[PDB]
Amino acid sequence: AALAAALAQAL
DSSP states (O other), rough: HHHHHHHHHHO
């Protein structure tokens, strides 16, 4: 989840 979300924010 941590990665999924962090990436979401970056894009």
